[PDB]
Amino acid sequence: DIVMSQSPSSLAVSDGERVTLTCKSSQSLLYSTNQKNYLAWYQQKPGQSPKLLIYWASSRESGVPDRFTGSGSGTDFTLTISSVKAEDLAVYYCQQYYSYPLTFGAGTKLELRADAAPTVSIFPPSSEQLTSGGASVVCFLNNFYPKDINVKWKIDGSERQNGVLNSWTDQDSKDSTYSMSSTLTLTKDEYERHNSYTCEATHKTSTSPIVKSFNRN
Amino acid sequence: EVQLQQSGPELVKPGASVKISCKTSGYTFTEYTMYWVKQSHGQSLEWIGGINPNIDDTTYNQNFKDKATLTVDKSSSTAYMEFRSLTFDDSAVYYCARDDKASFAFWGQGTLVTVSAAKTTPPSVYPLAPGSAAQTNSMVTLGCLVKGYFPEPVTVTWNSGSLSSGVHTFPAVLQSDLYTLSSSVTVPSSTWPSETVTCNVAHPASSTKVDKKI
């Protein structure tokens, strides 16, 4: 089957700059009789249907604005946007129509900028949690950027990876930031056999990891 | 221009069969072909197959062998798609694709088909509060955990919509055939703990509403 790769996966852009997307195929998608390239670029909004923008990889569809243009033929396919807007926050795809079965791309998403970082969001477990027979300590990461972050759970100096439930959010529409929650659940007698719980997270904009912990007794 | 109306969300158990429709209007059904695209993992798109309604030409993907058989309706002008032997990896949103020309293809609104061996439970909520007596930040953050509900979604507001600013809603995670979520809002230190706050969760599938004061 014809497989396609996309590069890069994600990139941070500002308002008004030029965005170039690359789609590469393993085989040639050029039909020699009519010099056409069977590939089309896609665009899907969060909560809406995916729509087409560029057909035959070099021509514009009616209804698409003049900022969306495409170039390339055969193997290298390029989609160049002249000036992005605030409504251009979407995920782009490229699909070939050369041979069956049809395959899709990996997906490219654009981001915004920049410079967000958290300090402390440590919440101890409440009294209503232990009556149900379990225990749960949470760690949020609000107002942080970029989304590439590593969370680590430490219990009395020992690393524990089982029971960690991570959850990432999308980009905010007010300050262009992200939020991440990490919930470690456990049973009730394991919570009483330990005292200290350390919430560890390493960041890119800091040269030292932020350490913070709390005690049970 | 052309309308592609599909079915709504369905709650099905594992082992049954689900049928997905795609109503066509505004154009003739016996001229253009219909395709199906399965969207998994949020962003990844998978091709299911296609059907020619006039000559009964049917092709399917290698990943959908003995799973998806396509059937068209020549009298009601609509398409049908049925699945057999549903498993846990079939939780995805499915679209019907209208192959008009090689220039443009029209899409539908999508059918959310989730599958779990799962009963509708009322959500149990617990308030969260920081256990420290003092802090260095001028803001105090709070939250409440929503655990043990089915199905999606649950609308979580704060103080009956008055504290709408600075709210952060996290997506749910499936653990033991039931979803869990959380929320965090930022509160200035001039109100807490002299002024009380409340968590308002709502579940229209269970018709419950519990208020927890922090």
Author numbering:
A (entry chain b): 1 to 217
B (entry chain a): 1 to 214
Give excerpts from the publication.
The S protein is a single-span transmembrane protein that protrudes from the surface of SARS-CoV-2 virions to engage the host receptor, human angiotensin-converting enzyme 2 (ACE2). The ectodomain of the S protein consists of a receptor-binding subunit termed S1 and a membrane-fusion subunit termed S2. The S protein of SARS-CoV-2 forms homotrimers on the virion surface and likely exists in two major states, namely the “closed” state with three RBD down (receptor-inaccessible) and the “open” state with one RBD up (receptor-accessible). By using a combination of biochemical, virological, and cryo-EM structural analyses, we identify three types of cross-variant neutralizing MAbs, represented by S5D2, S5G2, and S3H3, respectively, and further define their epitopes.
To investigate the molecular basis of S5D2-mediated cross-variant neutralization, we performed cryo-EM single particle analysis to determine the structures of SARS-CoV-2 B.1.351 S trimer in complex with S5D2 Fab. Three cryo-EM maps, including the SARS-CoV-2 B.1.351 S-S5D2-F1 (associated with one Fab), S-S5D2-F2 (with two Fabs), and S-S5D2-F3 (with three Fabs) states were resolved to 3.5, 3.3, and 3.5 Å resolution, respectively (Figure 4(A-F); Table S2; Supplementary Figure 8 and 9). (C and D) Side and top views of the S-S5D2-F2 cryo-EM map (C) and pseudo atomic model (D), with two up RBDs (RBD-1 and RBD-2) each bound with a S5D2 Fab. The epitope of S5D2 Fab on RBD would partially overlap with the binding sites of ACE2 on RBD, leading to clash and spatial hindrance between ACE2 and the S5D2 Fab. This is in line with the high potency of S5D2 on blocking the interaction between RBD and ACE2. However, the T478 K mutation site on the B.1.617.2 RBD is located within the binding epitope of S5D2 Fab.
